[PDB]
Amino acid sequence: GWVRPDLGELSKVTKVKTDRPLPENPYHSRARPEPNPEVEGDLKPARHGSRLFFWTM
Amino acid sequence: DAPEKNYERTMAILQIESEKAELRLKELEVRRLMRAKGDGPWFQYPTIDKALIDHSPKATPDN
């Protein structure tokens, strides 16, 4: 009683019911480095300008 | 000019210039610490973007 599968069927992506848990860290990655802190706050002007030796702005 | 005007104007000049000098010294120290540790917004040379990584299920499993 076995029907041979049609052209297209055996290459389908199927779904599988499992009773094993999902591997939570299959790559065994350690803790990620903490990122550099972003910038936050409004942009105040430069305190007394460029401060390049004598240029007051 | 009055000696009051020259005097208090000199105090204003000295405040502005001493504040600029202390900010320049802080700028040197900030640059030294950010180059040494790399944890500031400056001296952040690029690494590889991890938005290029394909996380799709590949052709072989062991990867």
Ligand SMILES: CCCCCCCCCCCCCCCCCC(=O)OC[C@H](COP(=O)([O-])OC[C@H](O)COP(=O)([O-])OC[C@H](COC(=O)CCCCCCCCCCCCCCCCC)OC(=O)CCCCCCCCCCCCCCCCC)OC(=O)CCCCCCCCCCCCCCCCC
């Ligand atoms: C109510 C709404 C309306 C309000 C309007 C109010 C104004 C009304 C009038 C409108 C026009 C305004 C014009 C600008 C304002 C005055 C600027 C000023 O005097 O700054 C003083 C400025 C600093 O003095 P201060 O007492 O500390 O500040 C007073 C103010 O607070 C100055 O303010 P500050 O401290 O915030 O200034 C910021 C900063 C202040 O400056 C600094 O922090 C110091 C560093 C400045 C640069 C130094 C460089 C040194 C090495 C290079 C030298 C080059 C050679 C010299 C020139 C050779 C001949 C071309 O500026 C700069 O760094 C800019 C660079 C210098 C340019 C100055 C403006 C020039 C405009 C006209 C140019 C015409 C040609 C003149 C010759 C070109 C060179 C000036 O003086 C100098 O640096 C010495 C040079 C003289 C300045 C230029 C004078 C402008 C008028 C020229 C008339 C004659 C022209 C003759 C024909 C052409 C030449 C042959």
